[PDB]
């Protein structure tokens, strides 16, 4: 399941979900680290 942290981009919309899937570059970097540790 794709994790939605609290510090993602919030979608201020009353017609749908309140949080998007747009990350932070720190989240991108740590996801790359976890990707390498799974790649082994």
């Amino acid at each position: 399941r794709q994790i939605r942290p609290y510090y993602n981009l919030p979608s201020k919309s009353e017609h749908g979900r309140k949080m998007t899937g747009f990350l932070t570059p720190y989240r991108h970097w740590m996801w790359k680290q976890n990707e390498l540790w799974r790649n082994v």
């Binding site: 790359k32 990707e35 390498l36 540790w37 790649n39 082994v40």
Partner: protein, 152 residues
């Protein structure tokens, strides 16, 4: 492409510093060129005056491997590997190095280990892969018995 490859290798070996222009004008956009074109052209890139021209030409050759769907061979990446102290062009991905270190350290400590050098029959081989067993276990019976009305 193999006809243009000999021309590119001749212009590299003669040291005329014009094989890259021939590769751009004739072989780059209109041929399915493989990776040994850049294995020839890296020696021509090496003979440049300044190191930054060598670096930018190697990086542009890597972008040419990305764009025209011609992946870099092992020999080209090993040619760029040997000059990493001068050019500092990274030629392996972030995934292959993390696999390589964790594999190489484990294989070195496994070869140095004296306990785990013993064979493992669960791991080393498959004992039998045929759909039928190799010797008769007695079954089937092919006859009925008491209380069995359905035969065959």
């Amino acid at each position: 492409a193999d006809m243009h490859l000999q021309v590119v290798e001749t212009m590299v070996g003669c040291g005329t510093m014009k094989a890259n222009d021939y590769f751009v004008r004739n072989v780059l956009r209109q041929f399915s060129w493989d990776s040994r074109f850049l294995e020839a052209l890296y020696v021509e890139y090496r003979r440049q005056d300044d190191v930054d021209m060598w670096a930018e030409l190697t990086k542009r050759a890597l972008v040419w491997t990305a764009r025209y769907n011609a992946p870099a061979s092992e020999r080209l990446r090993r040619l760029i590997e040997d000059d990493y102290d001068t050019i500092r062009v990274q030629t392996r991905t972030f995934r292959e190095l993390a696999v390589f270190q964790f594999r190489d350290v484990e294989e070195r400590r496994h070869s140095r280990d004296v306990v785990n050098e013993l064979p493992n029959p669960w791991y080393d081989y498959v004992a039998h892969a045929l759909p039928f067993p190799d010797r008769d276990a007695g079954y089937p019976d092919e006859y009925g018995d008491l209380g069995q009305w359905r035969a065959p």
